[PDB]
């Protein structure tokens with residue numbers, strides 16, 4: 468059988484690294500093939516739900532509209548900063564490994580893996596050392612509601628847009644900045660048009676890979692185990708790939724542009740942004756009810772356990 472798999476990124480990007488590894492495992496261990504569609508190579512979620520696609524990698528930044536609980540990742544300063552700790556969290560969290568698959572199942576998706584890509588970094592037309600610096604800045608967000616609220620809380624004017632629109636928008640001042648992991652900033656050449664990088668440490672770009680649930684459930688026990696085994700292999704490979712990635716990417720950027728500036732928020736400057744976080748958490752709960760409170764409680768507990 469041929470299994471169609473779509474993701475959000477380009478050749479060599481983090482999602483593609485995961486994809487290619489997944490594909491590789493399946494092909495190496497079965498008679499099956501995985502057909503991977505990169506960005507633009509085809510609404511990938513719609514296409515998965517209606518069964519055109521078997522697998523899809525979509526980030527909560529988008530999925531958060533359809534699956535409100537997925538917005539949890541956009542609560543600033545909830546997630547740790549340390550790669551090692553984040554990795555431990557993803558491996559061991561019941562929120563991630565037990566609860567979220569339940570939540571996705573409600574939408575007819577079989578959540579296979581959630582994984583981090585990189586720490587979020589702000590880019591803009593100036594350094595941003597304080598919420599005040601955000602004032603009257605149109606900052607692009609991915610298209611989920613909580614994420615807009617986050618940026619509003621930070622003092623910006625959130626402008627949610629599809630990825631396709633971002634480079635151009637920056638270039639002609641439709642937007643004043645955006646947020647993304649460094650590897651994407653680099654691979655996407657965003658630094659060319661948004662040269663001031665600020666490390667706010669407010670969170671991580673994360674993503675998820677899943678299967679159409681009917682498809683998955685429709686597979687033989689053997690093929691199910693294959694898929695699981697492949698996801699585990701891809702995860703492992705991808706985690707190895709991201710170690711040192713941000714550091715390499717930043718070097719790449721510095722090599723490419725003399726105009727790039729890097730601002731790293733100190734502990735004091737961080738607390739100021741952190742002051743804005745609780746209001747976002749409150750909104751999250753108002754969006755997701757008791758089910759949401761339960762997830763958040765587990766999330767926080769999980770975090771505590773790895774720290």
Ligand SMILES: CC1=N[C@H](C(=O)O)[C@@H](O)CN1
Nearest residue numbers: 475476609630647651672
């Ligand atoms: C890191 C990443 N950023 C894009 C975005 O910000 O829209 C996503 O669409 C895909 N991957």
Ligand SMILES: [Mg+2]
Nearest residue numbers: 494495497498
């Ligand atoms: Mg084969």
